[PDB]
Amino acid sequence: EYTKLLHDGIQPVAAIDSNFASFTYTPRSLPEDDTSMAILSMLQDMNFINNYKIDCPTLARFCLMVKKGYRDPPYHNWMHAFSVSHFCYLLYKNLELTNYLEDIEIFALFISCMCHDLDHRGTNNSFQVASKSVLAALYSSEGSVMERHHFAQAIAILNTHGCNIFDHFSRKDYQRMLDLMRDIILATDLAHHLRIFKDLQKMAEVGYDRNNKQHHRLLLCLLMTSCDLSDQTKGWKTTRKIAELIYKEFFSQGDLEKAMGNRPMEMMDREKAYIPELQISFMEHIAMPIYKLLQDLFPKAAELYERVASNREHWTKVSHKFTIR
Numbered sequence: 180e181y182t183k184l185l186h187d188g189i190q191p192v193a194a195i196d197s198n199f200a201s202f203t204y205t206p207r208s209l210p211e212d213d214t215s216m217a218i219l220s221m222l223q224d225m226n227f228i229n230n231y232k233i234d235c236p237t238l239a240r241f242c243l244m245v246k247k248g249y250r251d252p253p254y255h256n257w258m259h260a261f262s263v264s265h266f267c268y269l270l271y272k273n274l275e276l277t278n279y280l281e282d283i284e285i286f287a288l289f290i291s292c293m294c295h296d297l298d299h300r301g302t303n304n305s306f307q308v309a310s311k312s313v314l315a316a317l318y319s320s321e322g323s324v325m326e327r328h329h330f331a332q333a334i335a336i337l338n339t340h341g342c343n344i345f346d347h348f349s350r351k352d353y354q355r356m357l358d359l360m361r362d363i364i365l366a367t368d369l370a371h372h373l374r375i376f377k378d379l380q381k382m383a384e385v386g387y388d389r390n391n392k393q394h395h396r397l398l399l400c401l402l403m404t405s406c407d408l409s410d411q412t413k414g415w416k417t418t419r420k421i422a423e424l425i426y427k428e429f430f431s432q433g434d435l436e437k438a439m440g441n442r443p444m445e446m447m448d449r450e451k452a453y454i455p456e457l458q459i460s461f462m463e464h465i466a467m468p469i470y471k472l473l474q475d476l477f478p479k480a481a482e483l484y485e486r487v488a489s490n491r492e493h494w495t496k497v498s499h500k501f502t503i504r
């Protein structure tokens with residue numbers, strides 16, 4: 180399994196695809212069998228293997244473990260985690276995060292991306308609370324139920340024998356790695372994003388400051404959120420396709436909420452849901468602000484905001500006679 184992975188060395192990024200390091204590249208085009216390899220390539224391209232002296236066999240096992248630690252709902256599967264991770268790599272390469280963040284922080288972000296939805300069951304935090312799941316029992320009172328479970332699953336993978344990519348770290352770094360991984364994964368929750376939004380705008384107002392450690396915090400949260408939503412930054416074929424997976428998942432939960440006598444949200448109810456207006460609402464309230472904050476901090480992230488705005492134009496366009504339900 181893992182010996183087969185490292186039986187030919189770490190492939191360079193250009194050999195996977197020539198446009199691999201570009202924003203136009205859709206990582207979902209890469210076959211699922213070649214994705215663990217692609218992770219190793221990105222980690223070596225960012226020079227994280229040398230920097231933190233990550234043992235390669237251990238990194239390979241960790242990667243394969245993170246992979247099988249996802250289930251197979253329509254959207255929250257390994258391929259989502261992979262595409263979010265690829266996008267984090269695109270941010271490194273194109274927005275040059277090395278000028279803004281510490282190396283250990285960009286490393287944490289990438290690792291977080293791989294783990295950020297570990298063991299997702301195709302349902303959200305409200306459903307866990309509502310169905311009295313053990314996850315809700317463990318985490319509901321602190322908030323962000325699934326997010327704490329994801330981090331917890333990351334930890335259980337990192338402490339599996341032969342997967343501890345941090346085992347040799349200094350005490351100070353091992354700890355910062357743990358704090359950042361938790362904070363970055365928690366940041367993926369809409370509720371969290373809704374809190375720090377005021378502080379994100381103020382950061383974008385005054386200008387980014389490498390000496391301000393709160394700006395690092397907040398920048399990491401914004402970056403994570405923008406990797407998580409990166410399906411909205413590709414072409415219409417990708418974005419239109421991914422909407423089908425998202426609602427496929429949402430509609431399953433909606434059915435399960437009905438079977439326990441709960442009234443699902445409109446977006447979860449296929450009898451109520453008109454996808455165009457829902458995505459338009461998602462695009463303007465959540466997605467476009469996120470990428471407009473990313474543009475304000477990185478002028479080079481202008482082409483991402485436009486493609487999200489474009490995709491929101493495409494929803495209005497195709498609304499003319501789109502499937503009514």
Ligand SMILES: CCCCCC[C@H]([C@@H](C)O)n1cnc2c(N)ncnc21
Pocket residue numbers: 254367368369372404408422425458461465
């Ligand atoms: C700032 C954090 C936003 C979190 C929302 C995540 C959410 C589901 C799929 O988890 N999601 C992700 N893409 C979505 C989309 N195109 N339409 C509706 N919901 C979406």
Ligand SMILES: [Mg+2]
Pocket residue numbers: 295296325367
């Ligand atoms: Mg999540």
Ligand SMILES: [Zn+2]
Pocket residue numbers: 259263295296367407
């Ligand atoms: Zn996600």
